[PDB]
Amino acid sequence: SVDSKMLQATFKAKGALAPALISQHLANAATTAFERSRGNFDANAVVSSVL
Amino acid sequence: GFNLKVKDLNGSARGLTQAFAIGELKNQLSVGALQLPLQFTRTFSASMTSELLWEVGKGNIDPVMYARLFFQYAQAGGALSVDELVNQFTEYHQSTACNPEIWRKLTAYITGSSNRAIKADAVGKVPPTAILEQLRTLAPSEHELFHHITTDFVCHVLSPLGFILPDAAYVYRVGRTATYPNFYALVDCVRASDLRRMLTALSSVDSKMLQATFKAKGALAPALISQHLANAATTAFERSRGNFDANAVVSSVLTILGRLWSPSTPKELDPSARLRNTNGIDQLRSNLALFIAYQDMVKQRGRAEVIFSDEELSSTIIPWFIEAMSEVSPFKLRPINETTSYIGQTSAIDHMGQPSHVVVYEDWQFAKEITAFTPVKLANNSNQRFLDVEPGISDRMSATLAPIGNTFAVSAFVKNRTAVYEAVSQRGTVNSNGAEMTLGFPSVVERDYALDRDPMVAIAALRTGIVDESLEARASNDLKRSMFNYYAAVMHYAVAHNPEVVVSEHQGVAAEQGSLYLVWNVRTELRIPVGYNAIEGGSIRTPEPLEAIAYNKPIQPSEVLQAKVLDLANHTTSIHIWPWHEASTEFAYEDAYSVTIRNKRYTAEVKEFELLGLGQRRERVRILKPTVAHAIIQMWYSWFVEDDRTLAAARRTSRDDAEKLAIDGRRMQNAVTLLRKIEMIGTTGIGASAVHLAQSRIVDQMAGRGLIDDSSDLHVGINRHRIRIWAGLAVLQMMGLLSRSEAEALTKVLGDSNALGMVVA
Amino acid sequence: WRKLTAYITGSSNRAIKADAVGKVPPTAILEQLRTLAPSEHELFHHITTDF
C-alpha cells in the first residue's frame, strides 16, 4: 500500500511526530486491513451445508 | 465568557466535560486502547435562525412552518410526543374519514342548504371562520386546530371563487431552534416528511369543470366534493398508510452503527460485511454529524437495539433519511469545516513561548432598528389581536443606534483584550499552573435575558456543569440545549483544524461504556505542563479539548454570523402575536440629569417624552426589546473592571518601580477612549437638544442666582463634552442599557485625563 | 508498539532531519517486539515488519 515520501519529512526525514504518525500509519494499515477483514468471516460448516 | 483554569474543568465547570459527556464522574480521560482513525469530515448541520412570523391566513401545505409551530409546541412540552399527536390526529383525520356522512352533512349546510344546490346562484360564502368550530364540535377537538387548515384546503378550492369569501389572518411566529440536534429530532423529520407529504397531497385541487365545478351546480356535486374531501383524505392517508414504523428503531440503527464503530467488540457482535459494505450508510459512517450524535443519546439510553431488517435497514429507511430531505433538519450536509466561522479565537500567550489566556470568540453583527409599537388591544378580553406601531422615535433612535453600532466590533473586543496584555516576569503559564481560557458567549446569556431568567444559574449550570433546576423545566432544557451547542461546535471546530481523528473507545467505569473519542495530538512545542498532562513526548494528546485550541494560535472567524433578528409584522393587519407581553417592555424610565456648579445646583430630570420629542408619557406605547446589545455592553463594561482591579493590585505589589510606573498610562489611554465612546454618541441631536433643554433650564434656575458677567471662560471646553458625555449616559438610561448602578460607579473610578489632547494651553 | 518503534529507530523526541539513520538489518529487534508482542506461531509477525 505504502505512504510515500512526502514533504521534507516522509521525503526529507523529519518529525518524531512524523512516525508518531507512522505508527499511526501502522495503525492505519492495520485497521484498514482489519477492516476489510471485519465482516466477512462467517460460514465454514455452513459451506458444507451448502453442499 | 467562563474563564477557566487549565488543568480542571472537572471542577472548573465541573460537568462541562467530555467526561460529563459520558456522564463520567471524574474518572478516566486517558489513553489508549485501541485507537482508530476516523475523520468523517462532514456533517449534516444547519444554519442560523428558525424564528419567524408566521401569520396564518391562507394555509396551504408548506410544512415547515407548521412543523415549526409544532416544534414550538414540541418544545413547549405541550407537544413532545408530537408525533403521537399526529397519530391522534391520524385518527382524527381518520375520524374525519369516518364521519363523512357527518362531515358532508356539515359541509352541506355550510354552504348551503343542499338538495337542489346548483347553479350560478349568489353564494356569498364567507369568511368561514366560525363555522369550523361547529365542525370542531362535530369533530372532536384535538390540539389547536390542525383541523382548520384543512378547511382552508378546501376552501380555496371550494371557491372557484365565491365559495368562501374573504378572510384575515393571525399570528403565530415561530421562535428559533438549534444548530445541532438530537435523535428525536431526527425521527420526526422523517415523520414530517409524511406529514408534509400528507399535506402535500392535500393541495392538489380538482378544478372547475363543467357547468358545475365550473358553473356551480349539483348538490350531488359537492356531495361529490365531500367525496373529494374523502378522496383527498384517503389519498393523503394512503400515502401515509404504510410508512410509519421505526423510531426507537432508528436509534438502534445508530446502535448498529455504533456497534460498527466499536472495534474491539465481540466477533459475533460484528455487523456482517453484507451489512458493512452496503450503500453509503457505511458512507454514513464516514458521514460526523451523526457520530457525535449518537453516543450521547445512547448515553441516556445505556443501549438497547431492536433487531430487525438487514435489508431495509439495509438501508432504505436509511436513506429515507436521506436525512437532509428535510431541511427542517437543516442538518444538511456540510463539509464539516464550513462552520466555525463565527469562531475566531485569539489568545494571550507568554514568552517561552508558553501561553496565557485563550479566547475563543463569537462573532457578530448587531445592526438593528426598532420596533416600538402601539400596544392596544383590538380584542378585548382575549389578546390575540394585532395592535400596532409607528416610527417617530423609532427611527430617530435607531438612527442613533446605528452609530453606536458603528463603534463596537468583537474585533474591538479582542483588541481590547489584546489591550489587556502586557505582562512581564509575570505571570505563568508555566510559573503557576492553571491557564486561562475564555470563550465569548454572552450571546447565550442574551437569550436568557430574552428568556428573562437569571443568569447566575446559568453560571451554575456551567459551574456544576450540570443541571440546576428549581424552576421552569422548560427553561432548563432550554439552557440545556444551549449547552449542547456549547459542546457542540467546538471540537468540530477544533477538529476542523485538527484532523487528529482516531478512536479509542473509552470504556468508562468499565468497559462497555462505548464512548469514542480520540486523543488529539499536540505536536511540537517543547514542554508544557499545561493540562493534566501527558506530555506524550512533547506532543501531548488528550481527548480534552481546550488545550488543543491552545495549540492553535489565534484563529479568525470568517463571518460574524451576521445577526438577522426577526421583527414586526408589517403586513400586520389583523394578526396576532402570541407571546408578546414579555416580549415587550414599556419605556418608562425614572432618573434624571443635574449639575451643581458654583455651589448652586442645577437640576433636571428625565422627562422622557420630551426627550423624545412630542408628548406625552403613558402606560401605552410599548416597545420591543433591545437584546443584543445588552449582551454586548456589559462586555465592554465588564472588562475594564477587571482590569483596573487587577492592575491596581499589581500596581500595588510593584517590587520594582518601573513597571508600576509603566502600567498606568496604558490604563489611562483606554479611558479616554471610553470617553471617546461616550461623547461621541453624546453628539447626536436628539441628545444635543436634550442638552439644550437642560441648559436653558439650568440656566433658568440659575438666572436668579447668577449675577456675574464673567466672560469667555467656559469656552473652556468643558461643557460641551461635559454635558455631552453625560448626555450619552442618559442614553444608557433611556434605553436602559446599563444600570444606574454600575456606570456611575465606573464613572467614579474615572475622574481625570480629560483635559487630554486639547487647547491646554 | 509505537513506543517500541519509536526507539527502534531511534530515540524519539526531536526526531527529525536528514540525520544519518543507518537503520539496519532490523532482524533482532523484532524479537523484542515479539516479546512485547505475544508469540504466536512462527512469525507472521515479522512479515509485517517488513511491511
From Swiss-Prot, chain A:
It comes from the Viruses. It is found in: Virion. Transmembrane segments: none annotated. P1 is the major inner capsid (core) protein of the polyhedral procapsid, which is responsible for genomic replication and transcription. Forms a dodecahedral shell from 60 asymmetric dimers. Binds to RNA and may be involved in genomic packaging. Homodimer. Associates with the polymerase complex. This is Major inner protein P1. It comes from Pseudomonas phage phi6 (Bacteriophage phi-6). The gene is P1.
From Swiss-Prot, chain B:
The keyword Transcription applies. Keywords: Capsid protein, Inner capsid protein, RNA-binding, T=2 icosahedral capsid protein, Transcription, Viral nucleoprotein, Virion. Pfam families: P1 (PF20837). GO terms for molecular function: identical protein binding; RNA binding. GO terms for cellular component: T=2 icosahedral viral capsid; viral inner capsid; viral nucleocapsid. Coiled coil: none annotated. It comes from the Viruses. It is found in: Virion. The keyword Transcription applies. Its main location: virion. Homodimer. Associates with the polymerase complex. P1 is the major inner capsid (core) protein of the polyhedral procapsid, which is responsible for genomic replication and transcription. Forms a dodecahedral shell from 60 asymmetric dimers. Binds to RNA and may be involved in genomic packaging. This is Major inner protein P1. The lineage of its organism: Viruses, Riboviria, Orthornavirae, Duplornaviricota, Vidaverviricetes. The gene is P1.
